[PDB]
Amino acid sequence: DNNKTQYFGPDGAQVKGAFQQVNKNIYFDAQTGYARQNVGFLDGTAKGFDEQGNQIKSGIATDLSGNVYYFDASGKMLTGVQNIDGKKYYFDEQGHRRRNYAGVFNNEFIYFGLDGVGQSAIEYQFEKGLTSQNSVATSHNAAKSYDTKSFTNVDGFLTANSWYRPTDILRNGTKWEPSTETDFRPLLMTWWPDKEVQANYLNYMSALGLGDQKIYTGASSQLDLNNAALIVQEAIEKKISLEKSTKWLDDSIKSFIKSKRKDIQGNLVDTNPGWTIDSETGSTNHLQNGAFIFTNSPLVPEANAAEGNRLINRTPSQQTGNHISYASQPYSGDDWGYELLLGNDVDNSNPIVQAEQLNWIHYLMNFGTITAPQDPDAHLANFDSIRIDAVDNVDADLLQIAGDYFKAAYQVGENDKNANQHIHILEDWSPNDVWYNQQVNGNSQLTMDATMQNQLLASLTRPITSRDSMKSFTKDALLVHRTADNSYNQAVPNYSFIRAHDSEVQTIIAKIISDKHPDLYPTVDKALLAKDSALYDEAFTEYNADMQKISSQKQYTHNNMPSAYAILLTNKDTVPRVYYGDLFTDNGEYMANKTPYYDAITSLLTARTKFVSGGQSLSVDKNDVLTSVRYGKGALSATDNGSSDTRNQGIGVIVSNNPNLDLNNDKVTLSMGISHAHQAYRPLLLTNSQGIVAYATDSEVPQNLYKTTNDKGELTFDASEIKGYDTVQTSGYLAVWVPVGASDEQDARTIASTEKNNGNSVYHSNAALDSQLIYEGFSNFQTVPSKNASADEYANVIIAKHAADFNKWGVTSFQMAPQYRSSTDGSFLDAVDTVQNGYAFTDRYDLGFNAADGSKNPTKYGTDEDLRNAIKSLHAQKTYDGSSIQVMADFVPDQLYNMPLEQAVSVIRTDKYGVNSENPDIQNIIYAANIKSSGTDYQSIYGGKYLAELQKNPLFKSLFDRIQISTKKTIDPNTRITQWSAKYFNGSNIQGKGINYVLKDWASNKYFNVSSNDDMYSRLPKQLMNQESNTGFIVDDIGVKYYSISGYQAKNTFVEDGNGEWYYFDNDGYMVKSTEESGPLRTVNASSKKYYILPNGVEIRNSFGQDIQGNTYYFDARGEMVTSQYISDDTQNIYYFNNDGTMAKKGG
Ligand SMILES: [Ca+2]
DSSP: OOSOOOOOOSSSOOOTTSEEOOOOOEEEOSSSOOEEOEEEOSSSTTEEEOTTOSBOOSSEEEOSSOOEEEBOTTSOBOOEEEESSSOEEEEOTTOOEESSEEEEOSSOEEEEOTTSBEEESSSOOSOBEEEEOOOSSHHHHSBSOSSGGGBOOBTTBOBTTOEEOBSEEEETTTEEEEOOTTOOEEGGGTOOSSHHHHHHHHHHHHTTTSSOSSOOOTTSOHHHHHHHHHHHHHHHHHHHHHHTOSHHHHHHHHHHHTOEEOOSSSOOEESOGGGSGGGOOSOOOSTTSOEEEEOOOTTOTTSOOOTTOOOOOOOGGGTTSSOOOOOOTTSOOOOOOOSOOSSEEEOTTSHHHHHHHHHHHHHHHTHHHHHOTTSTTGGGGOOOEEEEOOGGGSOTHHHHHHHHHHHHHHOTTSOHHHHTTSOOEEOOOSTTHHHHHHHHSTTSSBEEEHHHHHHHIIIIISOGGGOOOGGGGGOSSSSSOOSSOOOSSOSOOEEEESOOSSTTTHHHHHHHHHHHOTTTOOSHHHHTTOOOHHHHHHHHHHHHHHHHSOGGGOSSSOSOHHHHHHHHHHOSSOEEEEEHHHHBOSSBSTTOSBOTTHHHHHHHHHHHHHHOOSOEEEEEOTTOOEEEEEOOTTOOSTTOOOOTTTTTOOOEEEEOOOTTOOOTTOOEEEEOOGGGSSOEEEEEEEEOSSOEEEOOSGGGSOTTTOEEOOTTSEEEEOTTTOOOOBSSSOBSOEEEEEETTOOSSOOOOOOOOOSOOSSSOSSOOSHHHHTOOEEEOOOTTBOOOOTTOOGGGSHHHHHHHTHHHHHHTTOSEEEOOOOSOBOOSOSSGGGSTTOOOSSSBSOTTOSSOOOTTOOOOOOSSOOHHHHHHHHHHHHHSBOTTSOBOEEEEEEOOSEEOOOSEEEEEEEEEEOTTOOBOOOGGGEEEEEEEEEEOOSSSHHHHHTTTTHHHHHHOGGGHHHHHOBOTTTSSBOOTTSOOSSOOGGGEEEEEOOOSOGGGBOEETTTTEEBBSSOOOTTSBOOOSGGGTOOOEEEEEEOSSOEEEEOTTSOBOOSEEEEOTTSOEEEEOTTSOBOOOOSSSOSEEEOSSSSOEEEBOTTOEEOOSEEEEOSSSOEEEEOTTSOBOOSEEEEOTTSOEEEEOTTSOBOOOOO
16 A cells, blocks of 8 residues: 555455564554554563564554553663653553652652653642732722621522622722612622632633733732732723613623633533533433432521431332332232422422422312402312322322312212212322222222223334234233123223323424434433424424324324224223324314314214213134124123113224235124124224214214124124225224114213212222213413413313313313413423423412413413313313213422522432432532522412311311321421422422532631521631731641632641642641651541542542552542552553552562
């Protein structure tokens, strides 16, 4: 080649990766053919060779790993200390040149740095000298007073955004005037926590025209930095006089703190890492990429919780303190819960909180009467039931608290009739929760059947590649066996569904976002943090397009949706839940656009009302065609002769999921009952190439389609009728047949019994309960009515109009969205301003009240008025048993978002389970968390308001006396929660304020605090109170002392100097420096932790060190000696360090 020389064997082979001669030991690289420089150990140990070939004499030579050898003339390597070009270098006994290595060599203490270059460990490495922080101006800039008055503060603490009142204002930069009350200025104008930040602040403000055209750094002198700040101050004050405002300064101070910068490498780094998320590192396993747990500390007395509160992870499975599987042989008993989900996690193991949760439930259940007392119909605008949200992320005690309430208020334990008038539901995703619910929790709330959901998806909704057999519907792991469901009051009461506002929607969108912009959002979990409205609009045009496509070309969305809904709505022993987004489009105006499936599904829904009743049986023939039969009311098997009600009731369903179904000579059979022999049947739903046909009466059917049962009550189908299809709505075949001659009076539903029941379950899976149906009446991605939206865009108005629609569909429980005024801060999907769905809120009692000026100010769904009217219209609708349509409140006890006020709290960095991510610098440190509510919100009005009232009631005695499982204590209604505070929270997601956002003197190592004059906090910087103040290192006949920028002395702390070396200062206020009498290896603080301190005082880090005896130790990033441990080196070298701390010796 050219500029490359390569060699091949006396053979086909290239000879990559080994040494070979020609006429000179040329190494050739294992990947590149190319001849490289290398060091060969063959023959005499340690020979060295260059690219051209031939031995290296008297020169440096570098290894494939990166090891640097030095040879003498004659080719032998050198070891020990060597002077190469008037520079000392250390070579170990392996001949490697080494960096970050300290030791006494030939009676000289040397430290070889990152270079490899020796420094004298005798010579001081810091600037000798102090620098006064007293100026002509310090008298004027000193604080007006040293207490809460004169500082903006978080519980007494100061942050980087603290503003203060100085004694004088340099007014229009020309005249020192006494300061008025409103003359506050940002602390960062006159004080900084070290020189580096000071330097950066100066460059930044100068970049806004308020500064010097000169670049500064931490390397720059202290006195220059101070003088330059004064020039900036003149500029600031003139601008303030010009603008008649300081808001501009607040803006530019805030943006400085989060400013980014170039680096040496050339990338964007944070200018102030300790004031941003960058410094908040730990585990990523939390939806928002980090979490804190709040933990008590003496420094922060009012953020501290009581003893034995903050019990994390009391999921139904672990309510006791330990996992308990309630599941039996076929079923799973896993728990996938975890305490810290999103936002600020409410502590529901605190009994005062638990009472506040009860209060809230009472409020919702009486929302109408409470909010509109003057209105004589207030009593008709009350909620009826609740949906418990995020059950696996809150203390399970709450399930019992609620169960107790509804027994107390509505006597739901008495009979089916009362129970079924208030139908609650759990968001209980863990498998174990089904059985916990049954054994521990009565069935006070309805479990979800997840086995049904997952099977409907696997067997029908998947593409053909991934799709399960229909035979799976007759499997054993299913919660409710329906192969021969011929009884009542056996099945575990449950609600079953296919999609929901979150499940099987938001993840399909996030996948699309990710498959278009992997650059920005590489995973689906990450994509849920997407906040740009552009990204959703884009994704949705795709999603909507995909839904219109044929089944074989559905790249993103669910196949066979009407086939699935047909099984779900005809199934026995379940309360079905319909998702809004399967009738209507998940995006756009509320109820404005229908899906491809609206016809099919709304047919089924009314049909259910007329025919679906009696016993059930599932089958799947050799061809894998599912045939589900309902025998009609009064008949529980195929061999049952039934009641008078049987003849004209009882549906039958046929489903295949094979698009190339060819029956050939085979036959499909719907075995209706012997109660249905010699009987004419007609289709409700059928599949063409064009789509699905829906016949809505007998008279819409053509006579040839009619078909009559034989003497056994069977229907038989040919290949002429049933083949494979591939439409938008069906891969495989779908058919629904109903008996001919039904009347308009005919209703298949059953009235609830008023008899007392045996056992502990509130609900019982029987005919009456199966007469119920839930409609999830919202979507995440419903468009958000713009500021000046017309009154009829708001979903709660549209609900009221269409009230009868839902009654016609058989709806008995209308599950509304959460109605709580949403955050718009984009911290998570639910809080982005384009989908303020109502799961992200600050004020749990605010369901859309008018503003203070009395202007209508609604939620996404409408005003409080509009909500009250939605509930009245639904209540005004009456179902088959004469009772109203129930309205369901989404009960969201897990968290709060986006709280207005900061509080000081003690934090530990953790993951979502609460497990300490063990970052050293985040161990019970002080954080300014947005964790306190306004105290003027509706929480402050209604919080705990009804608890005194409720205690006095006899009916609630059980509730209040009940011993809760996890707390082992009873609920505590005696304290009211009107302001949320940190003490009522388990923890929070990481808020990116930065570790060092709360300000602190580094010499004393105490926090500043202006609300206290206790000795656990440091007094204000000495200059900010017009006292003498100096900073720097000062050498003395005794030793070395150090004063911080604030003027205090270093005692019992480590101290980093000029982004370089670390040092330690003892109890006497003196630097620690090893002497000849007392060597370098030293405990310093009664911690069992050993450091390596040079005679400079330099405490070495990421570096090896030596005894005078000859042993080697390694000291980690924190400077601590390493024990019982392997250490990998830069050049891929390995060293083992014994429990001893000493290195294990090598020699080869
Ligand atoms: Ca929680």
